[PDB]
Amino acid sequence: HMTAIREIRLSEPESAQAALLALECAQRYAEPDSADFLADAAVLAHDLPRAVRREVERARLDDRLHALVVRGNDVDQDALGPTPPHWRQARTAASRRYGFLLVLYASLLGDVVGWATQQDGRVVTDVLPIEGQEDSLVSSSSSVELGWHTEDAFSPYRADYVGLFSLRNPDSVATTVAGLDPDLVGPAVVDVLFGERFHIRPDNSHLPTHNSGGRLSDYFAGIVEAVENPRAVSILRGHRDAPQLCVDSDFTTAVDGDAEAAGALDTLIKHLGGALYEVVLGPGDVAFLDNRNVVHGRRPFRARFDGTDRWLKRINVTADLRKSRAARRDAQARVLGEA
Amino acid sequence: HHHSSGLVPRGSHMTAIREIRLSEPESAQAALLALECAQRYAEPDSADFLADAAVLAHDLPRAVRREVERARLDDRLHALVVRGNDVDQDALGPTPPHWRQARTAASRRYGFLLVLYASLLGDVVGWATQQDGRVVTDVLPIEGQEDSLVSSSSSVELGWHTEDAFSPYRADYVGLFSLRNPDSVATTVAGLDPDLVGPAVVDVLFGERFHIRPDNSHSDYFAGIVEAVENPRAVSILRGHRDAPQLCVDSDFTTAVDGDAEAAGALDTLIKHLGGALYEVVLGPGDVAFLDNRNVVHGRRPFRARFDGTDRWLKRINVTADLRKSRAARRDAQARVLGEA
Ligand SMILES: N=C(N)NCCCC[C@H](N)C(=O)O
Ligand SMILES: N=C(N)NCCCC[C@H](N)C(=O)O
Numbered sequence: 086h087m088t089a090i091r092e093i094r095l096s097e098p099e100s101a102q103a104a105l106l107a108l109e110c111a112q113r114y115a116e117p118d119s120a121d122f123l124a125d126a127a128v129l130a131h132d133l134p135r136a137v138r139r140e141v142e143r144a145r146l147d148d149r150l151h152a153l154v155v156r157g158n159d160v161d162q163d164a165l166g167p168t169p170p171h172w173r174q175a176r177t178a179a180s181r182r183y184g185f186l187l188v189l190y191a192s193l194l195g196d197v198v199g200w201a202t203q204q205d206g207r208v209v210t211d212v213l214p215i216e217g218q219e220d221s222l223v224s225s226s227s228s229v230e231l232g233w234h235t236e237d238a239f240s241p242y243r244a245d246y247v248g249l250f251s252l253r254n255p256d257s258v259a260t261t262v263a264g265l266d267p268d269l270v271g272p273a274v275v276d277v278l279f280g281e282r283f284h285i286r287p288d289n290s291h292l293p294t295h296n297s298g299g300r301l302s303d304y305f306a307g308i309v310e311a312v313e314n315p316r317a318v319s320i321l322r323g324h325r326d327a328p329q330l331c332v333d334s335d336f337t338t339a340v341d342g343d344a345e346a347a348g349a350l351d352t353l354i355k356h357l358g359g360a361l362y363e364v365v366l367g368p369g370d371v372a373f374l375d376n377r378n379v380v381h382g383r384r385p386f387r388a389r390f391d392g393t394d395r396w397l398k399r400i401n402v403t404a405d406l407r408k409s410r411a412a413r414r415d416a417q418a419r420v421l422g423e424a
Numbered sequence: 425h426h427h428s429s430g431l432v433p434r435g436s437h438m439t440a441i442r443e444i445r446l447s448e449p450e451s452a453q454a455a456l457l458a459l460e461c462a463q464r465y466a467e468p469d470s471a472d473f474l475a476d477a478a479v480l481a482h483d484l485p486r487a488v489r490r491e492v493e494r495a496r497l498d499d500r501l502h503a504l505v506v507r508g509n510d511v512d513q514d515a516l517g518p519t520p521p522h523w524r525q526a527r528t529a530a531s532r533r534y535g536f537l538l539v540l541y542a543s544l545l546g547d548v549v550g551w552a553t554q555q556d557g558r559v560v561t562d563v564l565p566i567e568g569q570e571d572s573l574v575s576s577s578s579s580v581e582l583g584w585h586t587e588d589a590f591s592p593y594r595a596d597y598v599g600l601f602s603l604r605n606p607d608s609v610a611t612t613v614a615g616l617d618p619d620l621v622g623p624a625v626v627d628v629l630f631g632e633r634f635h636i637r638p639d640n641s642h643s644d645y646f647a648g649i650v651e652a653v654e655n656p657r658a659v660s661i662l663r664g665h666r667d668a669p670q671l672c673v674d675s676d677f678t679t680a681v682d683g684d685a686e687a688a689g690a691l692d693t694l695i696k697h698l699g700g701a702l703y704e705v706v707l708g709p710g711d712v713a714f715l716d717n718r719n720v721v722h723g724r725r726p727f728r729a730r731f732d733g734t735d736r737w738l739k740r741i742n743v744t745a746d747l748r749k750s751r752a753a754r755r756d757a758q759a760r761v762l763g764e765a
């Protein structure tokens with residue numbers, strides 16, 4: 086599909102209008118995921134430039150979308166200061182305005198959510214390289230390519246969109262993207278992948294090793310159960326003409342003794358690996374990946390750990406907040422796994 | 425003639441009804457936007473309009489949008505009611521004698537406005553087997569159908585139900601825009617108060633121990649419809665968080681699993697509870713309601729239809745929070761008609 090990547094390059098006025106609105110939010114509210122801001126977020130998002138809202142709406146209803154990319158948001162590199170050395174330190178005063186702007190864009194597509202078991206239950210999260218995590222399977226890696234995945238593939242409450250706001254990317258490190266062409270894998274493999282014949286485990290970002298030590302053990306019970314005793318699930322669902330994709334290259338296995346399944350997965354892993362194409366998010370670029378249609382990852386790179394490294398703000402978006410109420414503390418709470 | 429909004433309780437449901445009263449300027453602003461849409465787009469449910477509807481809805485009055493957004497995220501809502509839209513009765517002309525004659529030029533502006541309000545809550549959808557798959561449908565009494573199980577009845581009660589209770593693609597909201605209602609005829613509404621029901625019955629209702637068959641109203645999809653009647657899947661009536669459970673039941677079309685006497689008992693306990701808990705919402709001309717179909721059943725009282733062009737007439741719509749989830753039951757990405765393919 087020629088519009089699988091939908092791009093909007095902001096005019097100077099559109100960039101300035103979006104920055105003014107984000108700065109007005111930072112003037113009013115404490116955190117870019119403060120409860121009062123999130124209650125207000127859908128309507129405040131309506132104040133984004135009309136031409137931009139029109140293109141975001143076209144992307145939202147495009148069921149073959151890979152990513153919407155909004156290029157050319159204002160990012161003041163000097164005002165922003167150094168790239169923090171850990172996501173725990175990345176809730177900086179100077180970066181608030183970019184968290185608010187990410188939530189405003191995201192709220193055109195759905196409702197923002199976070200995870201009790203990821204980055205201490207923050208809704209606005211950070212992607213930056215961490216010294217000692219170079220060879221990890223988590224988004225703070227650098228030397229080892231981030232393996233392609235559906236975000237939170239293990240969960241029925243996985244996002245419909247993953248939002249990425251690039252604050253800085255001096256070495257032009259690519260985000261990787263791939264969809265599935267059913268015609269190129271075969272009706273045979275599609276049929277197998279549509280069967281509940283696979284195990285998808287929570288990735289390592291959901292482990293207590295990637296959260297603050299004080300975070301409640303109760304939050305992690307469900308994750309540990311999903312690692313030990315994964316449910317039998319499909320990789321494909323929906324219409325045969327526009328099927329949804331759910332798979333993590335490093336956390337997905339066929340159910341024991343299902344050689345057909347093991348072979349379908351093997352064939353899917355080889356097909357997605359080669360199809361993987363590059364999208365570079367420069368400073369001020371906001372992307373929304375359709376997590377129903379594509380797997381994504383990140384090319385290997387050398388981090389400098391000198392305060393100049395690549396830094397994204399990130400958010401999960403659901404089309405339907407109500408559906409996850411069983412996993413949320415209360416109606417307005419956005420943190421999946423607090424119930 | 426000033427803006428107001430407020431919470432109207434029913435039993436223990438403290439936000440059951442969220443009521444908004446449009447100021448005269450807000451009513452005029454909403455009417456002007458609907459009239460501009462009617463000048464720029466062919467139909468209230470044409471592809472050209474529905475591609476834009478969610479963005480054009482952002483042009484509705486800001487104070488109204490803030491209150492509708494609070495209703496959208498209230499998981500205990502029964503009905504959002506927006507009162508005081510402009511309806512020109514003289515220009516509207518008579519209530520048509522059948523929905524097949526009800527998609528009138530004079531009434532198009534109210535179809536556009538219903539879709540604009542609806543598009544603040546989600547994406548509009550229709551049903552292949554209902555009013556020729558129209559997304560904006562018509563509720564009016566039809567002569568010779570006074571005694572029926574459908575919304576064109578009058579003399580007999582329209583039994584309460586979750587809208588399309590049998591379907592995994594059932595709406596999140598049912599929208600109603602009243603064009604005329606001279607005799608103040610009500611929609612009936614009930615939710616479950618779990619503090620009025622034995623916890624054992626509530627536990628049974630969460631079990632997949634019931635058959636919700638479609639009405640006679642309702643191909644891979646239509647193979648699913650025959651299966652739904654002949655080999656109905658075991659489904660729950662309650663689902664989700666115990667503090668905010670969703671409800672899915674049809675007073676005329678729900679039974680327990682074969683030989684599950686305990687489920688048959690819990691079902692009948694729930695039917696008697698909801699029947700006793702029914703209250704009413706009356707929409708005057710220019711009043712719009714959105715029922716949260718996840719939380720409430722609805723129906724309609726007997727009323728005295730005259731079939732003289734003066735009868736009660738609503739525009740009606742279904743809204744989904746998640747259009748993508750039904751793609752297997754829609755013709756193409758943008759098509760809004762469930763069961764079309
Ligand atoms: N195949 C792999 N590596 N899957 C895990 C990807 C990392 C995603 C996680 N939310 C994070 O931000 O770390
Ligand atoms: N319990 C009952 N009566 N269930 C059937 C109701 C039919 C509703 C349909 N949307 C209509 O407008 O006719």
Ligand SMILES: [Fe+3]
Pocket residue numbers: 234235236247381382
């Ligand atoms: Fe990811």
Ligand SMILES: [Fe+3]
Pocket residue numbers: 587598722723
């Ligand atoms: Fe109904």
